Copies of this chain bind each other. A is one copy, B any other.
Amino acid sequence: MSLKVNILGHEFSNPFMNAAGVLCTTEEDLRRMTESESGSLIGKSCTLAPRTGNPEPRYFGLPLGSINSMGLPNLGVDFYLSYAAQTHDYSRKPLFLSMSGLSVEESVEMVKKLVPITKEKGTILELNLSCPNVPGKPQVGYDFDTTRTYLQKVSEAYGLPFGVKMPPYFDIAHFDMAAAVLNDFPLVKFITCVNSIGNGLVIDPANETVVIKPKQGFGGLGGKYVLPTALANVNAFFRRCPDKLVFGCGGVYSGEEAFLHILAGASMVQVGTALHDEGPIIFARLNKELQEIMTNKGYKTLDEFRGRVKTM
């Protein structure tokens, strides 16, 4: 039996990694992910200059998941580049970096700086087009003209295969339009579905008050709230972009949800809220539960059922 994944010119010991933004902001975070049993890791969505993010409280754990308005707290692109160039142990596992410039001009400058490091070390880019928590910064992925611009400029400046983190879509026309944009960019080699469900609102009935401080209580939803939306997006892009990989992100707490994501088309599976709750020990448990499920079904590799969800 094998959980191995061969994509992007690497072998991954297994399909699992952190969701961007969870256990990946500091060198300590990145160390703990690296020493984890995860198949991979991705660094926090970073910006050209450092950010401290939004005021507190900006995260709230819920029975069904999470709400967050972190505000892109990050140590700045130079930290993540130095990590990727100097610190990270590639014999342990491949590294992704997430980048979330707040304008096309900022993204261009950042990805340009990654090029030499990708060439030397094999560091992979995930471009974040779906941050829902910086005030006055709408989600790029909900604007297909803007999205086309970022993909054009990043394809030109970076010039190497990369991936995109997408916001959830909820309409077939949007799947169609998103894919038509993504299919115009041959350098877009994977699509991560999905970022949090943007701009939810949680209120505490006892004190009649929102639970997070920024944006009048409005923040992105992670966890159990997101699983059906995540599965849909994964499968929708899996079908519409056959020449690209899809990565699954959303609602994974167990081997079973990972199995569903893979069945829908996911090559890699990212874990956010659950990892924030349980710590990097989850990767060991997820490998065991996924192997258990496969053993029960008599599957020996992921390739036996990846993308084989059945319709009626």
Contact = CB atoms under 8 A, between A and B. Distances in A.
Interface of A: 57, 64, 67, 132, 135, 138-139, 142, 167-175, 197-203, 205, 207-210, 212-213, 215-218, 221, 224-225, 228-229, 231-232, 235-236, 239, 256, 259-260, 263-264, 293, 305, 308-312
Contact of A221 (B201, B228, B310): B228
A210 B138 contact: no
28 contacts: A135-B172, A138-B172, A138-B173, A139-B170, A167-B170, A168-B170, A169-B199, A170-B170, A172-B199, A172-B215, A199-B232, A199-B236, A200-B229, A200-B231, A201-B231, A203-B231, A203-B264, A205-B293, A208-B263, A208-B308, A208-B309, A208-B310, A209-B312, A210-B312, A216-B235, A216-B311, A218-B232, A221-B228
Contact of A235 (B138, B201, B208): B201
A231 B202 contact: yes
Contacts of A225: 225, 228
Copies of this protein chain in the complex: 2
Contact of A171 (B135, B171, B198, B293): B198
Contacts of A199: 169-172, 175, 232, 236
Contact of A138 (B171, B259, B293): B171
The 10 closest A-B pairs by CB, nearest first: A200-B228, A201-B232, A138-B173, A170-B198, A209-B310, A201-B231, A213-B312, A216-B311, A203-B260, A200-B232
Contacts of A201: 228, 231-232, 235, 264
Chain A residues touching B, majority SS: mixed
A165 to B, nearest CB: 15
Contacts of A171: 132, 138-139, 142, 167, 198-199
Nearest to A139: B171
Contacts of A168: 170
A173 B169 CA distance: 15
A213 B312 CA distance: 5
A229 B232 CA distance: 18
A132 B170 contact: yes
Nearest to A135: B172
